Motif scaffolding. Structure first.
Motif, short mmCIF file in Angstrom:
data_model
loop_
_atom_site.label_atom_id
_atom_site.label_comp_id
_atom_site.label_asym_id
_atom_site.label_seq_id
_atom_site.Cartn_x
_atom_site.Cartn_y
_atom_site.Cartn_z
N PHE C 576 83.85 16.03 63.40
CA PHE C 576 83.00 14.89 63.15
C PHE C 576 83.71 13.63 62.70
O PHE C 576 84.80 13.68 62.11
CB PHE C 576 81.98 15.22 62.05
CG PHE C 576 80.97 16.25 62.47
CD1 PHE C 576 79.76 15.88 62.97
CD2 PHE C 576 81.18 17.57 62.26
CE1 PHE C 576 78.79 16.83 63.36
CE2 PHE C 576 80.23 18.53 62.62
CZ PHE C 576 79.04 18.14 63.19
N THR C 577 83.07 12.49 62.97
CA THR C 577 83.38 11.27 62.24
C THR C 577 82.22 10.96 61.30
O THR C 577 81.15 11.56 61.43
CB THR C 577 83.62 10.09 63.17
OG1 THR C 577 82.58 10.07 64.14
CG2 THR C 577 85.07 10.22 63.82
N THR C 578 82.44 10.00 60.41
CA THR C 578 81.52 9.64 59.34
C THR C 578 81.30 8.15 59.18
O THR C 578 82.02 7.32 59.75
CB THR C 578 82.01 10.15 57.93
OG1 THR C 578 83.27 9.55 57.60
CG2 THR C 578 82.28 11.59 57.98
N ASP C 612 75.04 14.97 55.59
CA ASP C 612 75.40 16.36 55.71
C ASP C 612 76.38 16.57 54.57
O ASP C 612 77.52 16.04 54.55
CB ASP C 612 76.06 16.70 57.04
CG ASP C 612 76.15 18.24 57.32
OD1 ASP C 612 76.53 19.03 56.39
OD2 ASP C 612 75.85 18.63 58.49
N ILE C 615 80.09 17.28 55.00
CA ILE C 615 81.13 16.31 55.30
C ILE C 615 81.04 15.16 54.34
O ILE C 615 81.83 14.25 54.41
CB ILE C 615 81.06 15.78 56.77
CG1 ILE C 615 79.77 15.02 57.06
CG2 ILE C 615 81.16 16.93 57.77
CD1 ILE C 615 79.48 14.78 58.56
N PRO C 619 76.88 11.96 59.61
CA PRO C 619 77.83 12.09 60.71
C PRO C 619 77.58 11.00 61.75
O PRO C 619 76.45 10.60 61.92
CB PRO C 619 77.53 13.48 61.27
CG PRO C 619 76.13 13.69 60.95
CD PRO C 619 75.86 13.03 59.65
N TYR C 622 80.55 13.46 67.27
CA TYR C 622 81.18 14.72 67.18
C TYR C 622 81.77 15.18 68.50
O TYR C 622 81.33 14.74 69.58
CB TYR C 622 80.21 15.76 66.57
CG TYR C 622 78.97 16.07 67.31
CD1 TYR C 622 78.93 17.04 68.30
CD2 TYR C 622 77.78 15.44 66.96
CE1 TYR C 622 77.77 17.26 69.02
CE2 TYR C 622 76.62 15.72 67.64
CZ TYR C 622 76.63 16.61 68.66
OH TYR C 622 75.43 16.82 69.26
N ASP C 673 75.64 11.64 67.16
CA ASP C 673 74.74 12.59 66.39
C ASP C 673 73.35 12.01 66.33
O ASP C 673 73.16 10.78 66.08
CB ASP C 673 75.33 12.82 64.99
CG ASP C 673 74.76 14.08 64.28
OD1 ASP C 673 73.52 14.14 63.97
OD2 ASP C 673 75.59 15.02 64.08
#
Ligand SMILES: [Zn+2]
Ligand SMILES: [Zn+2]
Ligand SMILES: [Zn+2]
Ligand SMILES: [Zn+2]
Lengths: 697, 6, 697, 6
Positions: C576-578, C612, C615, C619, C622, C673
């Motif tokens: 994932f990225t955030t 989430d 993490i 997110p 992904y 996402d």
């Protein structure tokens, strides 16, 4: 995690150690002459450790680079080819200045040192002299047992002083170095970086006289028999596992005024990096046409590259975390806090204001001071100034001689003059003198030195050209002229027509005055620093932060676990590299040119019984959250049972700014796995005799 | 390389 | 994992789906018009899905980009600002050529297709024409039910044929686009890359007449009421979780001669990439001075950029995995296997030789054929030639008119001519004509075309300029003139003085002959391709490899799990990225210039109920090991329970070469996402009315 | 971006 813990701080870190995974008792680690802590040695600038009962010592390739270079010539280049002594009588001298210091005793002398400082009254110069006399006297008493060298250390700004006593081994010999394409794989491109794939190791052997006492080199010397030595791990090291390092970190600046940070970030680091880069470019071009210059200037070039890149890393790191902003904001917070205690916080505010005034005084002459220092650091000028100063000091009784010019310092001065042979080429040095003179004449009037202006007679290309032509006449370019003047007296210096020598006689009075100015400024720092730094520590404690002193070349312990770090969202660096990663970087060109035996071993998956199953190869380097800095190169990494799992050798790119502002998320040590040492010495550049000696053959 | 600078 | 599985292969993947984590039954998925598969629609070149009972459709920003661009002007730039219709009546038309195709039925017609082909006999041209005649009759019969469009697909080299019938929605309207700095965050710099931080989504609404039957745009149309729509996940997607995609991947070539691969890698991709980059640079430069050129060419520039970067990525990937080498070795293995079946292998061996000779035939004229086709695809020449061809075709009975030029294609042709209004500036198109003329003149003598040589009347810059000046007198630059020519007859074309029309009339006989040559080669391919390809499949099967047809624009299923990948030793990409990663890339300049509301919401940790916890953030994008290609942009990503967790939008850099040689270790889908869609529509560019309609507000 | 190329 964070902290370069002095060993007297073991009660505070005993719980944290057990929690991180240490299985040895803390009492065992507290025994600094015991097993395993007694195996760890100082090299002066690097760390090492004994790994056999017959005096074998392991350290990093970059720590032995100097010794390797001294034994190299253009036609037999050990840097490139490696070195392997089949028998101990094949071992070559690491050089006369090589040392192994084996810890004997530590003593707190804080109370005595502060008295001796207090007795000099409200006189700054007098205060420096009094601390110096107290140190010299203390060392003289401690060094009366033959074979020992003692050192006095000041911790936490002068709040504590401790005396270390070490067995000084003075016959150190090279036993093994891997080819440079292994020991320094990736060169300056990979330096300070991860992923890393470097076999950063090398071995020495320590020697003493037949009577057991230390002695300078002699075919009559025998291997020293250390009381303790490390053992290689029998359990495989994996992600999450406990690791600890003991070694000799040199300097950190985590307790510092904001203005000290700002001067270092905006002036010192960029100025030095710039100058080192210019000199690299010159020596690089000359060495492309001249293999003699390339080998002779190799160790100097490794230093320039390493320091300049470290500094570029620190500057980029400061931008990344807003270090200037953090230093500004925590300064406000501390000063806020001190004022809020009214009466009791006044001594620290006074100190802060004083320290701050001292900075500005250094700042006034920063350019003059650095330019003059580096100019006089070129080879013939360095030799001549050093040798003239020594003749001056020898006229005084030994107790009043400046540190570095006492009898106990004569061996190192003589050794350096001999070592310079393998590191000096006139045509190259002339270009470095030129560079520095060009920089000196760029300086403004108010940053000039009268004695140097006079010696030079003008501010133009013609005066430089004339200056160089004059200096080319020196006879200090041979080891024998240098040693002649090592023995001569002051009057002989004052009579000489050698132009390097005439330079030194001309400038020496200026250098002595600058030195007094510096000692006076240091005497004032000595009043104010301890008070303010004590307050920063109180503040830190009141904020629940970790409290330990900045590094000062004494023995420290750091501990934590094997783990990666995340430099950017969406990615992570893993804790280990592997053999396959070494070969993927192969280009056939320096610095990515592994030996054929390596490329073949990897292709044929010859893992030599060293493979770690969880990563599907033999591991090469790994990351962990230990807190090391310059000086820790070569330190042994120990596992939960005190067994050798690797050698510390670098930091990742984002770590280097922690010298000023510690960042836990991006601060990692890079170590070389003990399994890759072993693997290289089985399959690539073999040393079955050394493996046997360490019980792993 | 974590050698001591200077 | 690997495979673009046709729906009829469900029994073969039911086990693998269950093992990877699907919790619906395979029968539930095998109902292509039920829940949830009946929610998935084709857009022509992209996928999308219904997400409300009131006709709301979600797809990617890049799929809707054309629509957004058609509704934008220099003064009111929706690509930049986003679009949000507060009520369904504020929705704007996506343009007359926008479509939503809703699957209705699939029929195997293999046996009949093949009978029609065999009835043609030995003649290659007649063979192509038999198939075309078969298809047209089949399609006409299928489309007798009004509102439906049908399509005939050939699979596996012509070993299977299926007819798809779709409800054809013709009034598609734009309901919501986030601002371009979210929808295309990172632009062409991040395109085809991970880490990715892109809000790649947009919403349409499908409309039909009051009778419920498809109709063109009209203010009396009402929202379509889909039988099925998707629901957002109520369970947080995590690393390792099962995911699957349904969509319409357009083209793969994993079944290919080595020589086809070689021609593509060494000529076709580099040639097209170079031409696209040359044209990008002109339009870029021209748009920096003219905001109308900038907006009108934005969609064109987006495709040139995407395609040329994709082609660069493939060439790099081929070199990464030695694809040439793999293609050669594999082919040698297949030819070996065939030789070892004696008689029985002979027909595939012969077919191989016939395919290879056909590739050489097309190779002989490739520079001509490409250059002419792209020259003729500039706006005014493309319009002229299309319209003049339509006038020729309208004199024939409908059943004999070239596909693309029958009555069922008239709506599209007409729409294309209107859309052009928002995609054409004469001064820009003139630079593009000039580029193509310059390229035409560099062709060698044997790749030139008499009719263009003659029209040009010269071979140098002065001739180029005089043709450009002639062409500039065309009247085809207005939409009304293009539509006048759309309705006019052949004799009216042949009489015109419009210089674009005159060019079309002059070159048309040449285009028609090149066309016949292509149909002829195509007829020899119809005979040889099925036989070789069936042999490739049979061999793959005997090696135990996955067997599925190359993509061909029809409905496929792919499935797997959320996971990252490792691009090199010492590193991994996380799945994932955030939010914090989006802000870390901010520069304040396009393409890294997020809306200030995004920067404010992230700094204030306004996560909107969507964090989430695993993490630590909401997110953004992904990674997963699904097997997608061009055409799958916009496809819904479903979890174990068939709920929406994302939209497919891209592949990572290393994945694109899997179009020719599949690499499991670095082939990943990048998806946006579902939670980031919702987050943007709560905190950054709010659309509360849409969140309510989808039951998540 | 995984849109269909031509
Ligand atoms: Zn144990
Ligand atoms: Zn002499
Ligand atoms: Zn007209
Ligand atoms: Zn469930």
């Amino acid at each position: 995690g964070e902290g370069m813990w002095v060993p007297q701080q073991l009660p505070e870190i005993a719980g944290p150690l057990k929690k991180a995974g240490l299985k040895l008792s803390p009492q065992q680690i507290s025994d600094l002459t015991g097993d395993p802590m007694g195996a760890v040695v100082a090299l002066g600038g690097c760390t090492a450790s004994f790994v056999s009962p017959n005096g074998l010592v392991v350290t990093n390739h970059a720590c032995a680079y100097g010794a390797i270079q001294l034994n190299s010539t253009a036609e037999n280049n050990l840097i490139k080819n490696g070195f392997n002594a089949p028998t101990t009588a094949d071992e070559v001298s690491a050089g006369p200045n090589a040392r192994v210091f084996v810890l004997d005793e530590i003593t707190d002398v804080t109370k005595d040192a502060k008295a001796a400082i207090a007795a000099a009254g409200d006189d700054a110069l007098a205060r420096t002299k009094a601390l110096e006399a107290f140190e010299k006297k203390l060392i003289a008493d401690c060094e009366a047992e033959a074979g020992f060298r003692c050192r006095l250390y000041s911790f936490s700004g002068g709040n504590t002083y401790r005396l270390f006593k070490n067995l000084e081994i003075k016959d150190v010999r090279l036993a093994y170095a891997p080819p440079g394409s292994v020991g320094k794989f990736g060169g300056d491109i990979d330096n300070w970086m991860w992923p890393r794939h470097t076999g950063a190791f090398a071995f020495y052997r320590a020697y003493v006289g037949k009577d057991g006492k230390p002695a300078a080199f002699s075919k009559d010397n025998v291997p020293y028999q250390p009381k303790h030595w490390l053992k290689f791990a029998d359990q495989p090291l994996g992600a999450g596992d406990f690791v600890m390092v003991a070694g000799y970190p040199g300097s950190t600046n985590r307790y510092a005024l904001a203005a000290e940070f700002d001067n270092t970030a905006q002036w010192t680091y960029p100025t030095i990096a710039r100058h080192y880069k210019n000199q690299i470019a010159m020596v690089e071009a000359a060495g492309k046409q001249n293999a003699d210059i390339q080998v002779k200037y190799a160790a100097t070039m490794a230093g320039w590259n390493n320091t300049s890149k470290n500094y570029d890393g620190q500057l980029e790191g400061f931008k990344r975390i807003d270090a200037a902003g953090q230093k500004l904001r925590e300064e406000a917070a501390v000063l806020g806090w001190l004022k809020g205690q009214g009466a009791k916080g006044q001594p620290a505010l006074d100190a802060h204001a004083k320290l701050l005034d001292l900075l500005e005084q250094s700042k006034a002459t920063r350019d003059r001071d650095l330019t003059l220092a580096l100019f006089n650091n070129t080879a013939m000028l360095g030799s001549a100034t050093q040798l003239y100063r020594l003749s001056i000091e020898r006229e005084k009784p030994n107790a009043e001689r400046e540190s570095g010019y006492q009898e106990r310092d004569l061996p190192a001065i003589e050794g350096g003059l001999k070592q310079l042979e393998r590191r000096y080429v006139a045509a190259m040095d002339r270009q470095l003198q030129e560079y520095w003179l060009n920089e000196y004449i760029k300086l403004p009037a108010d940053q000039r030195v009268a004695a140097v202006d006079a010696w030079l007679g003008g501010n133009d290309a013609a005066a430089v050209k004339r200056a160089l032509d004059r200096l080319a006449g020196t006879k200090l370019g041979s080891t024998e002229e240098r040693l002649k003047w090592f023995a001569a007296d002051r009057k002989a210096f004052e009579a000489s027509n050698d132009p390097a020598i005439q330079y030194a006689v001309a400038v020496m009075p200026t250098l002595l005055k600058l030195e007094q100015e510096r000692k006076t400024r240091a005497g004032e720092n000595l009043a104010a620093r301890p008070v303010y730094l004590q307050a920063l520590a109180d503040y830190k404690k009141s904020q629940g932060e970790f409290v330990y002193p900045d590094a000062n070349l004494s023995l420290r312990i750091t501990f934590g676990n094997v783990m990666g770090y995340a430099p950017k969202d969406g990615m992570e660096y893993t804790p280990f590299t592997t053999l396959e990663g070494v070969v993927a970087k192969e280009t056939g060109q320096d610095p990515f040119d592994s030996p054929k035996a390596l490329l073949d071993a990897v292709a044929a998956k010859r893992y030599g019984g060293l493979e770690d199953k969880r990563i599907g190869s033999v591991p090469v380097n790994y990351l962990s959250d230990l807190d090391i800095t310059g000086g820790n190169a070569g330190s042994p990494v120990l596992d939960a049972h005190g067994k050798l799992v690797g050698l510390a050798f670098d930091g990742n790119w984002e770590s280097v700014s922690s010298n000023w502002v510690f960042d836990p998320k991006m601060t990692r040590m890079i170590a070389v796995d003990g399994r890759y040492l072993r693997w290289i010495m089985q399959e690539v550049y073999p040393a079955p005799q050394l493996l046997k000696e360490m019980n792993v053959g | 390389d974590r050698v001591y600078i200077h």
